[PDB]
């Protein structure tokens with residue numbers, strides 16, 4: 001990402017505590033994944049806290 | 050019956066208690082609401098499955 005070019009760049013940002021960092025994981029089943037936000041894995045993507 | 054897991058004092062790592070459940074229906078939402086998950090790592094399955 002530092003040394004390259006991409007045709008588009010979509011950034012989703014929100015205020016999120018690091019104590020709930022496991023609820024944003026890939027296969028998580030918490031309240032965040034079921035009702036708040038589901039990450040899309042169809043393009044190369046990163047998740048940064 | 051998740052009462053032995055949620056009633057007494059928890060044991061230590063060498064003296065771990067084991068519960069095996071067959072033929073029953075459990076409320077996963079209540080158990081996930083009781084605890085705050087710090088980290089998890091799964092093998093050949095994901096918690097949403």
Ligand SMILES: *[C@@H]1O[C@H](CO)[C@@H](O[C@@H]2O[C@H](CO)[C@@H](O)[C@H](O)[C@H]2NC(C)=O)[C@H](O)[C@H]1NC(C)=O
Pocket residue numbers: 076078079082
């Ligand atoms: C699993 O447990 C939760 C409680 O943690 C149950 O949710 C409650 O359901 C009753 C009955 O509808 C409501 O009056 C409460 O307000 C609910 N509480 C919460 C915190 O949601 C839930 O019904 C249980 N699951 C099943 C299938 O019975």
Ligand SMILES: CCCCC/C=C\C/C=C\CCCCCCCC(=O)O
Pocket residue numbers: 022023024028029030080081084086089096
């Ligand atoms: C923490 C309570 C553990 C209770 C164990 C008993 C039954 C659980 C059965 C399957 C566990 C699936 C949830 C795994 C953790 C999800 C992490 C999260 O929520 O992001």
